[PDB]
Amino acid sequence: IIWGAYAQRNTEDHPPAYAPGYKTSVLRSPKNALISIAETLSEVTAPHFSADKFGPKDNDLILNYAKDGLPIGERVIVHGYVRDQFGRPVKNALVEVWQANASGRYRHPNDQYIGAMDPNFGGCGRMLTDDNGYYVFRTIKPGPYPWRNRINEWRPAHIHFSLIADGWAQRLISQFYFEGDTLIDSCPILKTIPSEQQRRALIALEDKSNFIEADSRCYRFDITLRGRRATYFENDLT
Amino acid sequence: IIWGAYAQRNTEDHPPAYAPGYKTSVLRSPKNALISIAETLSEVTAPHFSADKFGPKDNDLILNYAKDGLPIGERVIVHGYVRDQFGRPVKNALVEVWQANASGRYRHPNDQYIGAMDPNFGGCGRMLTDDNGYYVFRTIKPGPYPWRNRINEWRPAHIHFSLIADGWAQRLISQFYFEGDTLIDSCPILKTIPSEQQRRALIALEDKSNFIEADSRCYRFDITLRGRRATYFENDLT
Amino acid sequence: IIWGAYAQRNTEDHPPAYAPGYKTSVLRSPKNALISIAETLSEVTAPHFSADKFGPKDNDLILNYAKDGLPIGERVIVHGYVRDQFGRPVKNALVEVWQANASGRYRHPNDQYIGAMDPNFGGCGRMLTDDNGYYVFRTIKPGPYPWRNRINEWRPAHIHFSLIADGWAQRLISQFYFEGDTLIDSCPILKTIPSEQQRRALIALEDKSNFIEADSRCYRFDITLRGRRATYFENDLT
Amino acid sequence: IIWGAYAQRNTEDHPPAYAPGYKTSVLRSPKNALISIAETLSEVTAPHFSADKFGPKDNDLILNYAKDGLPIGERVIVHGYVRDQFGRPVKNALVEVWQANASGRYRHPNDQYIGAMDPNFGGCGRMLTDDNGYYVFRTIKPGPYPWRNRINEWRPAHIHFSLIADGWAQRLISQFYFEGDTLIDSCPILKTIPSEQQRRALIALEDKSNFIEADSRCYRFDITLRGRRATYFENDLT
Amino acid sequence: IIWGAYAQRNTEDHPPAYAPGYKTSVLRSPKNALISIAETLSEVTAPHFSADKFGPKDNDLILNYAKDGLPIGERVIVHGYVRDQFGRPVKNALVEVWQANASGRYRHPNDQYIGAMDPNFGGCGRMLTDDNGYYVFRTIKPGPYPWRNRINEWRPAHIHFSLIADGWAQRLISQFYFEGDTLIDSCPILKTIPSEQQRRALIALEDKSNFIEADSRCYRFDITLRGRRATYFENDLT
Amino acid sequence: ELKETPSQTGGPYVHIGLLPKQANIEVFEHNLDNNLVQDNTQGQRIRLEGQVFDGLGLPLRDVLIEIWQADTNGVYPSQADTQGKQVDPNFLGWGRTGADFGTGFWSFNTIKPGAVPGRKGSTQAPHISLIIFARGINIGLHTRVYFDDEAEANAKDPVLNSIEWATRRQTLVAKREERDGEVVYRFDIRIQGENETVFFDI
Amino acid sequence: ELKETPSQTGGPYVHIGLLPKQANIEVFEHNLDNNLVQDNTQGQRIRLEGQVFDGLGLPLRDVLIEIWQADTNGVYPSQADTQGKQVDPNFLGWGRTGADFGTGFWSFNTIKPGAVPGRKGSTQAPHISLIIFARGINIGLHTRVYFDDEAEANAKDPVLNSIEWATRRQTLVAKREERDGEVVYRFDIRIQGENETVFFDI
Amino acid sequence: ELKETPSQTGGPYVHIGLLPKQANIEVFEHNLDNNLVQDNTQGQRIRLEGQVFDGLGLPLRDVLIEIWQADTNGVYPSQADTQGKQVDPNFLGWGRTGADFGTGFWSFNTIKPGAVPGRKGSTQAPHISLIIFARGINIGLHTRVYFDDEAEANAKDPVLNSIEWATRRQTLVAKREERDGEVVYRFDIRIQGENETVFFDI
Amino acid sequence: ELKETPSQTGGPYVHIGLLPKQANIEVFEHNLDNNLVQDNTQGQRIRLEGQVFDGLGLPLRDVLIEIWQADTNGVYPSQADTQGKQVDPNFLGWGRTGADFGTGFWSFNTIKPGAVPGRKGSTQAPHISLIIFARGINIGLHTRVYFDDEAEANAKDPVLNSIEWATRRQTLVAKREERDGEVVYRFDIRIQGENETVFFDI
Ligand SMILES: [Fe+3]
Ligand SMILES: [Fe+3]
Ligand SMILES: [Fe+3]
Ligand SMILES: [Fe+3]
């Protein structure tokens, strides 16, 4: 198989750059339209990360920062699959996540929220997807986060995730939420996304059969990245 | 992959132990609730049966008991797949079936039904599922069976089946019926099952494309067993 | 009848000037709102074109540029009526059209599309509507056109048309498409139009009864222009 | 796996032999009913074609006949999968296609249509499906074809295809159309097919994600052939 | 305006030639399909009938045969318009009608129905449409007619009509019925027509506002004939 | 756009309205008939006769026939004729008749038509357009009558050559005869079976 | 379970895609033809020829034909053949041709097939599977060609005996002839009417 | 009541249909151009030139422009003109041109228009109605060109005074120049940003 | 076919998960950083630094940046590179950093990339692909960094020439400087307003 370029990103399935409802986007959004280009080797290539460099607890947010005891909060496992738009699994992709603790408090110098800090929780982890595009990490369910967009704004509970896969054109950063959270319907950030079906694509579903008795609950969340088209005639990539 | 315990049996997808409509269950059902336990090696292990011990006609109820001639009745083939709840195929599982003959008469000392006995039909067979969880046997379609629950009770045509797979927790015995049988809607035994969707899970479907011309008809019936969860963190099984 | 001014153009039935989805409009759209004015003789008058100046093949795109042979493509006839919003026919209006060839290739210096050029096709014609506002021309159905808005953008097959009628306020340029073209639902340019009913107003309908056997197919497309109101009291136009 | 015979062709999913609406079928349709037979080695076997004999441009109708330049018309790629009715892929099946050019003109001595001939287009190609039953060819989208059934009859744009696979019983010749073509609803030939769902099975779908920027559009079209049943008991084939 | 050929007759809007339900059609219907031809002067021309030859009572079936008194039956007026499929009125077309009397008895040697003959009723008339395609005649409403298709067959009340207009291709003979007649839903002859909308096109509607007090009732019935297409390019008719 | 009014059979009593006199009904002073030749009609007189047979080889005794033709110079007495030539002022070009209730024979007294222009500058062989109406016939059947003594013209006729099944072309050619001094062309129409007459959708 | 893709006529120009050279199109270097005999092909050479007639007794001048057969020993050059015998390494067993645009004649140069095993241990008489494609034909018509010089084998053939209307069996038997030293089997196919060829749904 | 057909951009190749010669297409004998002055046209000749700039201050090299104006006496060569005065018989009053593909400059050779009557008995200052079409422009942009040497008339112009933002009025005034003996009015149009040209909805 | 997972802003605390140490979180032994040069990395060392400014001309003090580039020979350390050349075994080609919370400055220590093959046999000028993530930014912004000392190569670069607004091309060219003996390219990114940096949809 001789691969061609990645399929065109469908701008309609993503939030626009300018979204007045999400205030900080007003000054941090280009006024000019993005210039689309035909892909070259630069856009279809991406770095490789060896698993040798990852620690044993890198995907365990419950223990990778635990000092004196366990973090306070809801023990939950999150897993799922990473595929490209054509359904092909994405192997060995770097998945990085970060979140606030159970109080909705981030371990970051710029966070002054009254929510209590957890000395045993860090809030960040990472993993590589396997040959089936499968990924899995453990964590404490994050609490909603109050922030200043409009004075009384509240982010629904959420986990930040980033992916670096096979092509630079696939570079993606986003956030996923938990099924049933009532704050999902009023979040200005989630509302930057035009369609309803795309908003639901960011919701992790309760996976009851995979709950671990007297231990942890579990959420299922699949991620879809752009996919490459195969070439059967001219190969103009190079 | 390090396997954990089998997912919890969903009591709601099964008949309760006490079902007044099915009379004999009144005295043969515990009054106390079942005590749920965390699984150990005992519950996740099961015996292995070598195919060497099975005869060539073990899965052919039309010929495994034929003496002077062929059994009287509807020549039908029944096949399908055995999977665990997570969709994984169940390999080399022991499947045992037994049924009445075309008259709705069982070859059993305790059966005095006026329905005629067939000297060339036994009513029992067995098989092992293959690597894809596929199974297949041949038989004579069983006739409905009159029995005494309420004086004029009639079991719809049915075949009894039993499975012994990879884990003791999977041990299952049940019965399947044939699509279209009008007796299905009034059977007290089938009605012990709470939901309608679960009742339909016991109906073998007509598989017309797999009919064998001038020979046999065919029914498709898939069986679903409990499945094990994978473990990615602590392994408390042992 | 003493004519007054043309009815106000309904800005809601037209695309706005600023349409981010259609990239080049970002820098070529006024930031200030249009200033509406009461009409004067300047806005209600327009030039007159004598048919004496038009050639016999001006409305025949199949033959007006044919040199050695006929153009390659789908022989189609397009006709319809030009009316003002009040249903009155628009007589002797200048209709000018231009399009790409069957390959979706325009005969224009700035077009480098790989689509093949047709030495016998020019792609432009013109006509004057008759006393009933009726117009008719012949052409080769244009093929879809790939262009760079987003890298893989494709214009559905279309024909460009321009009208100069009785009043300058009526000056209109637009494009019409062909019924059934699946590219119609994803075109960013066609989507600049707010309502769905207005988008459909640009679709030429298959006119099967007017097909010419073993020769040409036919499409029906009516155009509606702004219309003047009659005055029965004060005449402030002058 | 010991294969048996192919499943019975479902006469209801195909046009009858006698179809008055399609005039030439009146004298070229048997008056007697077809005589069904049990299959033998003759019906389940078929020839094998080595790829060694195929040229590099056999599946490229844009270039396999190009002499001085490129053909005039819509550059389109057509791909899809060939499966048997049971979903199994059909490997190394010979696929042969032929069509008219962009003018709806066939390169055939008996075609006198006024539509212009393209000196650089032949209108025929062939391929072998791969191990996944996948096939792919390039071509110019054919223009509708006027013909004499009723005097003003018009075939919607279409491509003729033929398949020779694993069994003679699978021998199939047909035609596929393009999504959105309005001529599809009035074609007497397409109407010879009884059901609506079967008519839609001959429509190639627009595959926008597989469009190649500034180059070609793409259609997806899957073909389903008859499939063989497996045998687990008597093998009467021979 | 340079006229071309008449639009193709839509065979789907007419009864087929072979209609088993209408018995006599079995032996009087060609087995071969009709051969469609491109029209010539022969098909687009037709005879002209001067009104000078028509008598004053030719369109009055109540009086044109009255000898000693008036016919027995329901005095009804029938009028309507004759247009071509494009809505143009058909001027000076010859309209000829004939029907049975109020007893459902025809004044024809071959009619032996027990229904009583009316010495003052003939059952035939004729007219020419005016410049607006308007026609009008007076008559006695015909009674249903028993006939032998199946032994107890009954024609709903009906009037036979024939038209000879501007082109031979327009030659048409048919029958119209009266709104509300319950026999309409079971007539084998009316059922030879495929669609329901076409069957309703033969029903004369009650025109209450045009009833003439203490005199006659009135029915409205419009007739549509094939229409010619205009030619704007080549004129191959001759 | 409107759909054409659906056709229906003329029925067994079609004579009442189209040929009153044959049904013994005298209501009209001027009755349309099967005689197209007037006193000053130009051209050679001819008689067109024959029968119409069903699928059993039996004649229809209730069929009604009409013909439409050009004058001796190939000009139709119709405002739709675009030839620019003056047509015979004493020729209607149309006629109607009915088979005999007893024998099934029909006939017309007319003139042999002149060659009429075909499409794209071609020339059609002399012919008469004919239509059949009757019980059992849902839509009037169209056909043409050519003459066997015009072999050269027929061989070049566009319509006859548009029939790909060559053996059927002969079903449209009437045979010339001469009862004494009168010219008679026999044209038998066969709706079904062998030698089935070619019918057109015009 | 999926439904089989619906069939459609091959159309009048079926030659473009299946027999390019006959349509005067040279695009392929290797063109599939009606010659199944190679240099080292075993068995006695034979020529299969004939015509295909419509309901009017007229030959189809646009029909396309294909045949599928076993080698001289009754073994099909197909991986689906389960006989366990080695097939002739120089035999494709398949061929395609088209009737002549002018005369309607078609022909194949092949080998007379050996007896092939039937169902339930029976033996089939030598035969060639043939299929017809053409304008007017909605689904390819299947039939078989048996040989008249194999009377004894034909009398015991399972397929021929599965046809209860005995008089129709003969329509499947080709007649042997000998143009000089070459063996020729004439096989005429009649789609409609009398002596209509038997067609199978396989 | 019907809705007006929705507008769409003229597109980058608008020249094909409106200015064929600029796209190197010779199909018409009579080509509409940017020259409104004929041999016997009355009034003082003037040249109107300039450029159209986008939001980046860059000229549009694919814009098409048209102008509509009255004759030297303020009478439009239109049947819609109700002044009752005779218009210049040698003046179309309309012209079309396209920016240069390389430089972006456009120009028209015309006549300076006479004052035209305004609404309610007012008098408009001399002006030319101009419209802009181009890729990126969804609906043709309307504007007017006034002349700086008509300061007194402009000060009393109804349209210019209907613009409440006084500082914008100047964007509609072209500057007079004199290349030798020819009068030239420079009129630059700015679609976006500072000094954005006033656009009207007429 | 599935739709791509919708993008969301990285948020103000993006450092927690992508640059833990900058957020004072020590959880990983191996931390990804902004240093692409290793001991045996080939090519001339260079420092890429600058700031990112918002629509007010103020630097973003919470922006995160990543770069992707080829080695000194124009080969990407990616299995997707099809050049067939051996890449520098001691080069990841990727790096990540964050603006300083106080000043807004960011920087990377890397190597100047070699020319990489363009589409259709063209050659791209040396460049580094860069992406911007931050609060207020809904989708990562893509752009490229070219070098001013490669004027000849830039003039022929396909991507730079695909930008029709020529004046914007310069926003993608970093300026070379030399703090003592070290080579430094300054690249300031402006998200909005004048001199707005060109952003690509790749
Ligand atoms: Fe009647
Ligand atoms: Fe075709
Ligand atoms: Fe365009
Ligand atoms: Fe957050």
Side-chain angles (χ1 to χ4, degrees), chain E residues 98 106 145 155 158 160 175, chain F residues 10-11 13:
Chain E
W98 68 102
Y106 281 98
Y145 185 73
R155 295 305 315 298
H158 64 289
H160 291 271
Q175 303 172 44
Chain F
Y13 314 123

Side-chain angles (χ1 to χ4, degrees), chain E residues 92-107:
Chain E
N92 294 297
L94 172 63
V95 177
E96 297 169 295
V97 300
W98 68 102
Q99 64 176 79
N101 67 191
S103 299
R105 180 64 180 293
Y106 281 98
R107 177 176 288 291

Side-chain angles (χ1 to χ4, degrees), chain D residues 109-163:
Chain D
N110 293 174
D111 190 5
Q112 304 302 298
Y113 179 45
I114 202 66
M117 275 286 302
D118 192 325
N120 294 128
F121 189 79
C124 73
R126 61 190 182 187
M127 319 120 282
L128 288 178
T129 55
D130 61 34
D131 303 300
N132 300 306
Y134 184 71
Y135 78 85
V136 59
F137 66 100
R138 188 165 70 175
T139 190
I140 284 299
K141 187 175 180 180
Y145 185 73
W147 60 302
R148 187 173 64 165
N149 188 58
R150 280 173 294 185
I151 201 59
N152 211 332
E153 213 79 72
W154 292 75
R155 295 305 315 298
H158 64 289
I159 290 180
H160 291 271
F161 69 89
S162 171
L163 281 72

Side-chain angles (χ1 to χ4, degrees), chain A residues 9 11 13-17 22 24-32 34-49 53 58 64-65 85-86 96 98 106-110 123-124 126 145 160 164 168-169 171-175 177 189-190 193 197-198 202 223-224 226 236-238, chain I residues 1-10 12-18 20 23 25-28 30 32 54-56 60 62 66 68 76-83 92 94 96 101 116 118-121 124 127 129 131 133 135-139 142 144 162-163 168 191-192 196 198-202:
Chain A
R9 163 165 289 173
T11 59
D13 298 326
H14 291 279
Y22 173 39
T24 51
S25 77
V26 177
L27 298 175
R28 301 184 173 189
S29 58
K31 72 92 64 186
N32 285 292
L34 301 175
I35 292 177
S36 293
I37 61 174
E39 293 182 347
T40 67
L41 284 180
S42 299
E43 296 68 50
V44 306
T45 54
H48 294 280
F49 302 83
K53 304 173 181 177
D58 287 9
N64 68 22
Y65 203 74
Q85 71 194 76
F86 300 110
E96 297 169 295
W98 68 102
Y106 281 98
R107 177 176 288 291
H108 189 292
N110 293 174
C124 73
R126 61 190 182 187
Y145 185 73
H160 291 271
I164 299 177
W168 197 235
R171 191 72 184 81
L172 177 68
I173 276 183
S174 194
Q175 303 172 44
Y177 312 80
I189 290 183
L190 182 56
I193 297 173
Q197 56 177 173
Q198 278 297 74
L202 297 179
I223 305 173
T224 303
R226 293 170 65 189
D236 303 310
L237 196 56
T238 58
Chain I
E1 176 173 51
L2 299 61
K3 288 185 172 300
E4 184 187 10
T5 295
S7 174
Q8 293 284 68
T9 180
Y13 314 123
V14 65
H15 310 75
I16 294 178
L18 307 188
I25 307 178
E26 303 190 307
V27 189
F28 301 150
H30 180 64
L32 291 43
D54 59 25
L56 291 180
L60 283 64
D62 55 20
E66 293 185 1
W68 170 240
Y76 286 98
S78 167
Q79 300 188 311
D81 191 281
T82 61
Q83 302 189 66
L92 190 60
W94 176 86
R96 173 191 294 159
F101 285 166
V116 176
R119 298 168 60 69
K120 303 179 177 178
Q124 310 191 71
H127 63 281
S129 289
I131 191 169
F133 294 107
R135 167 182 54 128
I137 296 179
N138 298 322
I139 316 170
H142 294 285
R144 280 186 179 191
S162 72
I163 299 178
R168 305 198 68 202
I191 298 176
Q192 218 179 71
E196 181 178 294
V198 170
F199 290 114
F200 301 117
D201 184 342
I202 67 174

Side-chain angles (χ1 to χ4, degrees), chain F residues 6 10 32 38 62 65 81 93 117 127 139 157 163 177:
Chain F
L32 291 43
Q38 297 178 55
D62 55 20
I65 315 301
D81 191 281
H127 63 281
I139 316 170
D157 184 87
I163 299 178
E177 298 173 53

Side-chain angles (χ1 to χ4, degrees), chain E residues 12-77:
Chain E
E12 304 175 74
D13 298 326
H14 291 279
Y18 179 68
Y22 173 39
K23 295 183 184 182
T24 51
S25 77
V26 177
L27 298 175
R28 301 184 173 189
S29 58
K31 72 92 64 186
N32 285 292
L34 301 175
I35 292 177
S36 293
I37 61 174
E39 293 182 347
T40 67
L41 284 180
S42 299
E43 296 68 50
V44 306
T45 54
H48 294 280
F49 302 83
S50 60
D52 289 301
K53 304 173 181 177
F54 301 119
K57 294 171 187 172
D58 287 9
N59 70 321
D60 185 353
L61 291 71
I62 296 187
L63 301 176
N64 68 22
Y65 203 74
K67 311 299 181 179
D68 302 307
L70 293 171
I72 301 295
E74 294 169 45
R75 297 165 62 76
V76 301
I77 292 177

